[PDB]
PDB file of C-alpha atoms and ligand atoms in Angstrom:
ATOM      1  CA  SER E   1       9.734 -27.488   7.881  1.00  0.00           C
ATOM      2  CA  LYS E   2      12.109 -29.203  10.430  1.00  0.00           C
ATOM      3  CA  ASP E   3      10.650 -27.195  13.787  1.00  0.00           C
ATOM      4  CA  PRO E   4       9.221 -29.269  16.260  1.00  0.00           C
ATOM      5  CA  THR E   5       5.192 -29.188  16.456  1.00  0.00           C
ATOM      6  CA  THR E   6       2.076 -29.993  18.134  1.00  0.00           C
ATOM      7  CA  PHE E   7       0.913 -31.019  14.530  1.00  0.00           C
ATOM      8  CA  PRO E   8       3.725 -33.213  12.795  1.00  0.00           C
ATOM      9  CA  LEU E   9       3.701 -34.241   9.547  1.00  0.00           C
ATOM     10  CA  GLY E  10       3.348 -37.872   8.447  1.00  0.00           C
ATOM     11  CA  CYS E  11       3.594 -40.113   5.511  1.00  0.00           C
ATOM     12  CA  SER E  12       1.782 -42.348   3.274  1.00  0.00           C
ATOM     13  CA  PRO E  13       3.721 -45.180   2.056  1.00  0.00           C
ATOM     14  CA  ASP E  14       2.710 -47.497  -1.010  1.00  0.00           C
ATOM     15  CA  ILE E  15       1.992 -50.563  -1.391  1.00  0.00           C
ATOM     16  CA  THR E  16       5.117 -52.148  -0.526  1.00  0.00           C
ATOM     17  CA  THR E  17       4.668 -53.940   2.979  1.00  0.00           C
ATOM     18  CA  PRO E  18       6.177 -51.676   5.734  1.00  0.00           C
ATOM     19  CA  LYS E  19       8.618 -53.807   7.892  1.00  0.00           C
ATOM     20  CA  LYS E  20       8.157 -54.436  11.669  1.00  0.00           C
ATOM     21  CA  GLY E  21      10.656 -52.296  14.097  1.00  0.00           C
ATOM     22  CA  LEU E  22      13.450 -49.690  13.791  1.00  0.00           C
ATOM     23  CA  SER E  23      16.775 -49.536  12.690  1.00  0.00           C
ATOM     24  CA  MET E  24      19.576 -49.248  15.323  1.00  0.00           C
ATOM     25  CA  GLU E  25      23.050 -48.486  14.905  1.00  0.00           C
ATOM     26  CA  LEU E  26      25.399 -48.848  17.894  1.00  0.00           C
ATOM     27  CA  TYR E  27      28.957 -46.859  18.645  1.00  0.00           C
ATOM     28  CA  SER E  28      31.464 -47.002  21.005  1.00  0.00           C
ATOM     29  CA  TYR E  29      31.769 -44.199  23.742  1.00  0.00           C
ATOM     30  CA  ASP E  30      35.424 -44.382  25.685  1.00  0.00           C
ATOM     31  CA  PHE E  31      36.129 -43.147  28.739  1.00  0.00           C
ATOM     32  CA  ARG E  32      38.798 -40.644  29.203  1.00  0.00           C
ATOM     33  CA  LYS E  33      42.345 -41.524  29.722  1.00  0.00           C
ATOM     34  CA  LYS E  34      43.241 -43.281  33.183  1.00  0.00           C
ATOM     35  CA  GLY E  35      43.306 -40.693  35.925  1.00  0.00           C
ATOM     36  CA  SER E  36      41.325 -38.358  34.293  1.00  0.00           C
ATOM     37  CA  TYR E  37      38.897 -36.399  36.742  1.00  0.00           C
ATOM     38  CA  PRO E  38      36.379 -37.032  36.304  1.00  0.00           C
ATOM     39  CA  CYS E  39      36.954 -40.710  34.393  1.00  0.00           C
ATOM     40  CA  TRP E  40      34.005 -39.964  31.975  1.00  0.00           C
ATOM     41  CA  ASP E  41      33.813 -38.071  28.599  1.00  0.00           C
ATOM     42  CA  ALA E  42      31.851 -34.793  28.478  1.00  0.00           C
ATOM     43  CA  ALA E  43      31.737 -35.146  24.644  1.00  0.00           C
ATOM     44  CA  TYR E  44      28.168 -36.752  24.830  1.00  0.00           C
ATOM     45  CA  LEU E  45      26.918 -33.189  25.481  1.00  0.00           C
ATOM     46  CA  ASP E  46      29.074 -31.246  22.953  1.00  0.00           C
ATOM     47  CA  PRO E  47      25.868 -29.357  20.840  1.00  0.00           C
ATOM     48  CA  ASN E  48      26.872 -31.140  17.775  1.00  0.00           C
ATOM     49  CA  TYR E  49      27.636 -34.679  19.285  1.00  0.00           C
ATOM     50  CA  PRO E  50      24.067 -36.316  18.341  1.00  0.00           C
ATOM     51  CA  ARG E  51      24.546 -34.819  14.922  1.00  0.00           C
ATOM     52  CA  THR E  52      27.959 -35.334  13.474  1.00  0.00           C
ATOM     53  CA  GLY E  53      30.141 -35.922  16.602  1.00  0.00           C
ATOM     54  CA  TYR E  54      28.910 -39.401  17.319  1.00  0.00           C
ATOM     55  CA  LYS E  55      30.120 -40.556  13.755  1.00  0.00           C
ATOM     56  CA  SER E  56      33.848 -40.119  14.788  1.00  0.00           C
ATOM     57  CA  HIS E  57      33.457 -43.307  17.296  1.00  0.00           C
ATOM     58  CA  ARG E  58      33.713 -46.899  16.208  1.00  0.00           C
ATOM     59  CA  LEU E  59      30.759 -47.952  14.890  1.00  0.00           C
ATOM     60  CA  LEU E  60      29.615 -51.549  16.548  1.00  0.00           C
ATOM     61  CA  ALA E  61      26.556 -52.979  15.047  1.00  0.00           C
ATOM     62  CA  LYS E  62      23.787 -51.861  12.576  1.00  0.00           C
ATOM     63  CA  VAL E  63      20.643 -53.637  13.065  1.00  0.00           C
ATOM     64  CA  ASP E  64      16.915 -53.840  12.076  1.00  0.00           C
ATOM     65  CA  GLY E  65      13.851 -55.076  13.538  1.00  0.00           C
ATOM     66  CA  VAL E  66      13.724 -53.143  16.876  1.00  0.00           C
ATOM     67  CA  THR E  67      10.229 -53.799  18.251  1.00  0.00           C
ATOM     68  CA  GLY E  68       8.215 -54.716  21.543  1.00  0.00           C
ATOM     69  CA  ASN E  69       9.559 -53.030  25.081  1.00  0.00           C
ATOM     70  CA  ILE E  70      12.529 -51.213  24.269  1.00  0.00           C
ATOM     71  CA  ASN E  71      13.114 -50.006  27.998  1.00  0.00           C
ATOM     72  CA  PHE E  72      15.869 -51.288  29.650  1.00  0.00           C
ATOM     73  CA  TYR E  73      17.632 -50.830  32.904  1.00  0.00           C
ATOM     74  CA  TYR E  74      21.455 -51.984  33.048  1.00  0.00           C
ATOM     75  CA  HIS E  75      23.133 -52.255  36.552  1.00  0.00           C
ATOM     76  CA  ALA E  76      26.963 -51.888  36.707  1.00  0.00           C
ATOM     77  CA  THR E  77      29.352 -52.573  39.597  1.00  0.00           C
ATOM     78  CA  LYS E  78      31.944 -50.174  39.422  1.00  0.00           C
ATOM     79  CA  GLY E  79      32.437 -46.538  38.124  1.00  0.00           C
ATOM     80  CA  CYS E  80      35.230 -45.406  35.590  1.00  0.00           C
ATOM     81  CA  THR E  81      35.056 -48.974  34.342  1.00  0.00           C
ATOM     82  CA  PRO E  82      33.650 -50.627  30.944  1.00  0.00           C
ATOM     83  CA  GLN E  83      31.671 -53.408  31.873  1.00  0.00           C
ATOM     84  CA  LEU E  84      29.914 -55.842  29.637  1.00  0.00           C
ATOM     85  CA  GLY E  85      25.555 -56.313  29.199  1.00  0.00           C
ATOM     86  CA  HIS E  86      23.197 -57.086  26.798  1.00  0.00           C
ATOM     87  CA  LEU E  87      20.427 -55.143  25.513  1.00  0.00           C
ATOM     88  CA  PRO E  88      16.737 -56.645  26.223  1.00  0.00           C
ATOM     89  CA  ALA E  89      15.900 -59.084  23.538  1.00  0.00           C
ATOM     90  CA  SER E  90      13.651 -56.625  21.853  1.00  0.00           C
ATOM     91  CA  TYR E  91      16.754 -55.034  20.389  1.00  0.00           C
ATOM     92  CA  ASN E  92      17.546 -58.044  17.953  1.00  0.00           C
ATOM     93  CA  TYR E  93      21.475 -57.759  18.997  1.00  0.00           C
ATOM     94  CA  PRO E  94      22.526 -61.106  20.689  1.00  0.00           C
ATOM     95  CA  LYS E  95      26.510 -59.976  21.349  1.00  0.00           C
ATOM     96  CA  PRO E  96      27.541 -58.066  24.603  1.00  0.00           C
ATOM     97  CA  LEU E  97      29.048 -54.589  24.357  1.00  0.00           C
ATOM     98  CA  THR E  98      29.914 -51.921  26.914  1.00  0.00           C
ATOM     99  CA  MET E  99      26.836 -51.103  28.660  1.00  0.00           C
ATOM    100  CA  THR E 100      28.473 -48.713  31.012  1.00  0.00           C
ATOM    101  CA  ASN E 101      29.324 -46.511  28.111  1.00  0.00           C
ATOM    102  CA  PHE E 102      28.029 -46.533  24.687  1.00  0.00           C
ATOM    103  CA  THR E 103      25.767 -44.436  22.069  1.00  0.00           C
ATOM    104  CA  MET E 104      22.834 -45.964  20.279  1.00  0.00           C
ATOM    105  CA  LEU E 105      20.761 -44.643  17.553  1.00  0.00           C
ATOM    106  CA  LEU E 106      17.225 -45.732  16.392  1.00  0.00           C
ATOM    107  CA  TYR E 107      14.720 -44.201  13.626  1.00  0.00           C
ATOM    108  CA  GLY E 108      12.101 -45.491  11.540  1.00  0.00           C
ATOM    109  CA  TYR E 109       8.430 -44.550  11.889  1.00  0.00           C
ATOM    110  CA  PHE E 110       5.325 -44.645  14.563  1.00  0.00           C
ATOM    111  CA  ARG E 111       2.093 -45.490  13.284  1.00  0.00           C
ATOM    112  CA  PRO E 112      -0.856 -44.755  15.810  1.00  0.00           C
ATOM    113  CA  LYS E 113      -4.118 -46.764  16.206  1.00  0.00           C
ATOM    114  CA  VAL E 114      -6.313 -43.564  17.647  1.00  0.00           C
ATOM    115  CA  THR E 115      -6.450 -40.087  16.055  1.00  0.00           C
ATOM    116  CA  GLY E 116      -5.764 -37.687  18.915  1.00  0.00           C
ATOM    117  CA  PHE E 117      -3.613 -36.278  21.056  1.00  0.00           C
ATOM    118  CA  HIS E 118      -0.583 -38.712  22.133  1.00  0.00           C
ATOM    119  CA  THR E 119       1.848 -37.723  25.166  1.00  0.00           C
ATOM    120  CA  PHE E 120       4.896 -39.846  25.196  1.00  0.00           C
ATOM    121  CA  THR E 121       7.187 -39.614  28.525  1.00  0.00           C
ATOM    122  CA  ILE E 122      10.711 -40.333  28.374  1.00  0.00           C
ATOM    123  CA  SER E 123      13.740 -40.619  30.742  1.00  0.00           C
ATOM    124  CA  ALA E 124      17.167 -42.006  30.480  1.00  0.00           C
ATOM    125  CA  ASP E 125      20.579 -42.508  32.022  1.00  0.00           C
ATOM    126  CA  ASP E 126      22.361 -40.523  30.503  1.00  0.00           C
ATOM    127  CA  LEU E 127      20.752 -39.243  27.612  1.00  0.00           C
ATOM    128  CA  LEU E 128      18.175 -39.548  25.277  1.00  0.00           C
ATOM    129  CA  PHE E 129      17.246 -36.999  22.391  1.00  0.00           C
ATOM    130  CA  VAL E 130      13.889 -37.263  20.155  1.00  0.00           C
ATOM    131  CA  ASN E 131      12.921 -35.984  17.125  1.00  0.00           C
ATOM    132  CA  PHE E 132       9.458 -36.805  15.981  1.00  0.00           C
ATOM    133  CA  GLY E 133       7.324 -36.008  12.135  1.00  0.00           C
ATOM    134  CA  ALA E 134       8.730 -35.339   8.733  1.00  0.00           C
ATOM    135  CA  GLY E 135      11.113 -32.976   8.470  1.00  0.00           C
ATOM    136  CA  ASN E 136      11.840 -32.550  12.213  1.00  0.00           C
ATOM    137  CA  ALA E 137      13.202 -35.998  12.344  1.00  0.00           C
ATOM    138  CA  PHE E 138      13.709 -36.835   8.576  1.00  0.00           C
ATOM    139  CA  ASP E 139      11.563 -36.514   5.333  1.00  0.00           C
ATOM    140  CA  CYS E 140       8.875 -39.255   3.846  1.00  0.00           C
ATOM    141  CA  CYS E 141      11.146 -42.363   2.313  1.00  0.00           C
ATOM    142  CA  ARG E 142      13.895 -39.915   1.952  1.00  0.00           C
ATOM    143  CA  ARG E 143      15.713 -40.885   5.040  1.00  0.00           C
ATOM    144  CA  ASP E 144      18.928 -41.109   3.614  1.00  0.00           C
ATOM    145  CA  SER E 145      19.018 -37.402   2.230  1.00  0.00           C
ATOM    146  CA  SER E 146      17.821 -35.570   5.366  1.00  0.00           C
ATOM    147  CA  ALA E 147      19.130 -38.065   8.194  1.00  0.00           C
ATOM    148  CA  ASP E 148      21.706 -35.155   9.379  1.00  0.00           C
ATOM    149  CA  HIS E 149      19.165 -32.520   9.091  1.00  0.00           C
ATOM    150  CA  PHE E 150      16.938 -33.128  12.103  1.00  0.00           C
ATOM    151  CA  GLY E 151      15.374 -30.180  13.601  1.00  0.00           C
ATOM    152  CA  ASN E 152      15.409 -29.020  17.086  1.00  0.00           C
ATOM    153  CA  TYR E 153      14.604 -31.390  19.699  1.00  0.00           C
ATOM    154  CA  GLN E 154      11.050 -32.734  20.445  1.00  0.00           C
ATOM    155  CA  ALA E 155      11.916 -33.852  23.832  1.00  0.00           C
ATOM    156  CA  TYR E 156      14.908 -34.501  25.822  1.00  0.00           C
ATOM    157  CA  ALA E 157      16.181 -36.194  28.991  1.00  0.00           C
ATOM    158  CA  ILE E 158      19.519 -36.107  30.814  1.00  0.00           C
ATOM    159  CA  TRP E 159      20.468 -37.910  34.048  1.00  0.00           C
ATOM    160  CA  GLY E 160      21.335 -35.456  36.801  1.00  0.00           C
ATOM    161  CA  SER E 161      19.630 -32.433  35.212  1.00  0.00           C
ATOM    162  CA  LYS E 162      16.756 -30.119  35.787  1.00  0.00           C
ATOM    163  CA  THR E 163      15.398 -32.217  32.775  1.00  0.00           C
ATOM    164  CA  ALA E 164      15.890 -35.664  33.853  1.00  0.00           C
ATOM    165  CA  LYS E 165      12.404 -36.545  32.178  1.00  0.00           C
ATOM    166  CA  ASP E 166      10.357 -34.886  29.592  1.00  0.00           C
ATOM    167  CA  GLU E 167       7.197 -35.287  28.093  1.00  0.00           C
ATOM    168  CA  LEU E 168       5.851 -34.677  24.531  1.00  0.00           C
ATOM    169  CA  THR E 169       2.355 -33.997  23.266  1.00  0.00           C
ATOM    170  CA  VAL E 170       1.249 -34.318  19.497  1.00  0.00           C
ATOM    171  CA  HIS E 171      -1.863 -34.585  17.984  1.00  0.00           C
ATOM    172  CA  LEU E 172      -1.361 -37.905  15.061  1.00  0.00           C
ATOM    173  CA  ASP E 173      -3.966 -39.447  12.941  1.00  0.00           C
ATOM    174  CA  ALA E 174      -4.414 -43.343  12.835  1.00  0.00           C
ATOM    175  CA  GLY E 175      -2.638 -45.103  10.098  1.00  0.00           C
ATOM    176  CA  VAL E 176       0.003 -42.477   8.878  1.00  0.00           C
ATOM    177  CA  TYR E 177       3.554 -43.521   9.749  1.00  0.00           C
ATOM    178  CA  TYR E 178       5.382 -40.477  11.445  1.00  0.00           C
ATOM    179  CA  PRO E 179       9.068 -40.270  11.179  1.00  0.00           C
ATOM    180  CA  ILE E 180      10.682 -40.629  14.840  1.00  0.00           C
ATOM    181  CA  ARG E 181      14.686 -40.479  15.455  1.00  0.00           C
ATOM    182  CA  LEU E 182      15.953 -41.368  19.183  1.00  0.00           C
ATOM    183  CA  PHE E 183      19.467 -41.009  20.228  1.00  0.00           C
ATOM    184  CA  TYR E 184      20.984 -42.519  23.047  1.00  0.00           C
ATOM    185  CA  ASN E 185      24.228 -42.263  25.452  1.00  0.00           C
ATOM    186  CA  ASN E 186      25.558 -44.123  28.622  1.00  0.00           C
ATOM    187  CA  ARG E 187      28.513 -42.265  29.806  1.00  0.00           C
ATOM    188  CA  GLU E 188      29.459 -44.364  33.079  1.00  0.00           C
ATOM    189  CA  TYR E 189      28.026 -46.821  35.155  1.00  0.00           C
ATOM    190  CA  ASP E 190      24.324 -47.666  35.217  1.00  0.00           C
ATOM    191  CA  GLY E 191      22.118 -47.251  32.018  1.00  0.00           C
ATOM    192  CA  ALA E 192      18.837 -46.584  31.495  1.00  0.00           C
ATOM    193  CA  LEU E 193      16.033 -45.871  28.638  1.00  0.00           C
ATOM    194  CA  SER E 194      12.338 -45.361  29.168  1.00  0.00           C
ATOM    195  CA  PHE E 195      10.203 -44.478  26.247  1.00  0.00           C
ATOM    196  CA  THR E 196       6.409 -45.005  26.434  1.00  0.00           C
ATOM    197  CA  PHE E 197       3.013 -43.059  25.787  1.00  0.00           C
ATOM    198  CA  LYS E 198      -0.713 -42.665  26.390  1.00  0.00           C
ATOM    199  CA  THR E 199      -3.182 -41.384  24.201  1.00  0.00           C
ATOM    200  CA  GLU E 200      -5.858 -38.585  25.469  1.00  0.00           C
ATOM    201  CA  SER E 201      -8.559 -41.136  24.975  1.00  0.00           C
ATOM    202  CA  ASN E 202      -7.878 -43.892  27.846  1.00  0.00           C
ATOM    203  CA  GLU E 203      -5.559 -44.152  30.832  1.00  0.00           C
ATOM    204  CA  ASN E 204      -3.706 -47.329  29.372  1.00  0.00           C
ATOM    205  CA  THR E 205       0.218 -46.960  29.184  1.00  0.00           C
ATOM    206  CA  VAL E 206       1.699 -48.433  25.948  1.00  0.00           C
ATOM    207  CA  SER E 207       5.263 -49.696  26.165  1.00  0.00           C
ATOM    208  CA  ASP E 208       5.265 -52.678  23.725  1.00  0.00           C
ATOM    209  CA  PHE E 209       5.470 -51.111  20.127  1.00  0.00           C
ATOM    210  CA  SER E 210       4.910 -54.203  18.176  1.00  0.00           C
ATOM    211  CA  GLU E 211       1.915 -52.625  16.445  1.00  0.00           C
ATOM    212  CA  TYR E 212       3.667 -49.257  16.578  1.00  0.00           C
ATOM    213  CA  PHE E 213       7.199 -49.157  15.106  1.00  0.00           C
ATOM    214  CA  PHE E 214       7.939 -49.554  11.481  1.00  0.00           C
ATOM    215  CA  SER E 215      10.552 -49.222   8.652  1.00  0.00           C
ATOM    216  CA  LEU E 216       9.996 -48.324   5.279  1.00  0.00           C
ATOM    217  CA  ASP E 217      11.891 -47.872   2.399  1.00  0.00           C
ATOM    218  CA  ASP E 218      13.279 -45.169   0.800  1.00  0.00           C
ATOM    219  CA  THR E 219      12.185 -44.391  -2.942  1.00  0.00           C
ATOM    220  CA  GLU E 220      13.573 -41.883  -5.494  1.00  0.00           C
ATOM    221  CA  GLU E 221       9.829 -40.221  -5.266  1.00  0.00           C
ATOM    222  CA  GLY E 222       9.209 -39.898  -1.545  1.00  0.00           C
ATOM    223  CA  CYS E 223       6.194 -40.878   0.156  1.00  0.00           C
ATOM    224  CA  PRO E 224       4.811 -37.749   1.793  1.00  0.00           C
ATOM    225  CA  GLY E 225       1.726 -38.042   3.880  1.00  0.00           C
ATOM    226  CA  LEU E 226      -1.632 -37.562   1.609  1.00  0.00           C
ATOM    227  CA  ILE E 227      -3.872 -36.766   4.684  1.00  0.00           C
TER     228      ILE E 227
HETATM  229 CA1  LIG L 301       7.144 -49.487  -3.567  1.00  0.00          CA
HETATM  230 CA1  LIG L 302      25.095 -43.829  33.342  1.00  0.00          CA
END
């Protein structure tokens, strides 16, 4: 089912070794033409922007192995102006980009260490939309066939809105691989992404996803959760 749920379905990959990290695609996000009021494009809030609209902009990069702490804060000096910066080393992308104005998609799997409830907390400047679970994000080792068919967001944050931070609480089983999709945009000026979680079992905040994000190969058979 594509609908978001407190009890998401996960995946059981075969022997082939999971690879560390998420995959990432970077895209352009231009300003409006000189003198427009305001200067930033509102396309990022088109209902279909996270599904199809982004693909009409320019592909910048496709990277594998994104893991570790994926949080960032980029400080711009000027409005209405493309300015260069770098993502943190965790993104495995060693080129500058226009950090003031870009779109980023990350996808893969989250593998828990604890069976029980997890609460992920997110915030972003400007936008972070999260899908989580088989079907809601994509299907088990069948990402290519289902990548565009994700469901209602499990959580979302939009800078400047009444929902500028959000939480998602899900019950998960240790060692199972859960499809995840993170879609981020910066429209102008500063950018920021925060993505962390806690489990109901203790007070520790987890922000380093070294032990938790993996990529699995698609297969003809699929790898549906057997638990
Ligand atoms: Ca295999
Ligand atoms: Ca911004």
